[PDB]
Every structure is written in C-alpha cells, then in structure tokens.
Amino acid sequence: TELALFSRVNGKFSTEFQRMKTLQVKDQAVTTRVQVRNRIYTVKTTPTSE
Amino acid sequence: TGFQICKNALKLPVLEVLPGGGWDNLRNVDMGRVMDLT
Structure with a gap:
C-alpha cells in the first residue's frame, strides 16, 4: 500500500x-x-532280512 | 557279488542305474532285486 497526500506526506506498507x-x-x-x-x-x- | 575288486582294479565308478529290480506297477517304486548281479 502506498499513500501520498499533498505530494509531501508519504506512507508505504508492504506485507508478505x-x-x-x-x-x-x-x-x-x-x-x-x-x-x-x-x-x-x-x-x-x-526281503531276506532277519 | 561285490564290485569293490572291480573299482580297485580299474579306478572307475559303477553304473548306478541297474535293471532286474522288480517294480510295483501300482504305486510305482522299486521293490526288490530279482536277477543276480555279480
């Protein structure tokens, strides 16, 4: 997320x-x-054995 | 009726399938010796 207001106030928010x-x-x-x-x-x- | 004289003289085996021995034709196994083998 990138949010710039008045071309001076910047905010970045990068999640992974x-x-x-x-x-x-x-x-x-x-x-x-x-x-x-x-x-x-x-x-x-x-047969002739005793 | 023994071959040990023969084996001593010749140094040779003796044939081990010898005929003459009766055979029961019912259950098919050799049964006895009929003819004299010398």
Whole structure:
C-alpha cells in the first residue's frame, strides 16, 4: 500500500506471507522365500532280512 | 557279488542305474532285486 497526500506526506506498507509445506512418505516391503529339497538315495530293506 | 575288486582294479565308478529290480506297477517304486548281479 502506498499513500501520498499533498505530494509531501508519504506512507508505504508492504506485507508478505510465504507458507511452504512438504510431506513425504515412503514405504517398502520386501519378502523372499527359498525352498530347497534334495533327495539323493532311497534306502529300502531287503526281503531276506532277519 | 561285490564290485569293490572291480573299482580297485580299474579306478572307475559303477553304473548306478541297474535293471532286474522288480517294480510295483501300482504305486510305482522299486521293490526288490530279482536277477543276480555279480
């Protein structure tokens, strides 16, 4: 605002309002599953076992 | 009826898929040894 009266009386009135905001969200979810199954031999009993 | 003489002489593995062993055709698993392997 600028107000000049009689070309001699001056008045200035300068206002400012800055308002900044910031929001960040980060989510993360890692799932891992390893299943291993070896089967090497198969051991059976002879029918002639005592 | 053992191959350990053979392995000692030749230094070689013995084939591990040998026939002759009976096979239950119902549940499909080997069941016994029928033919003599010497």
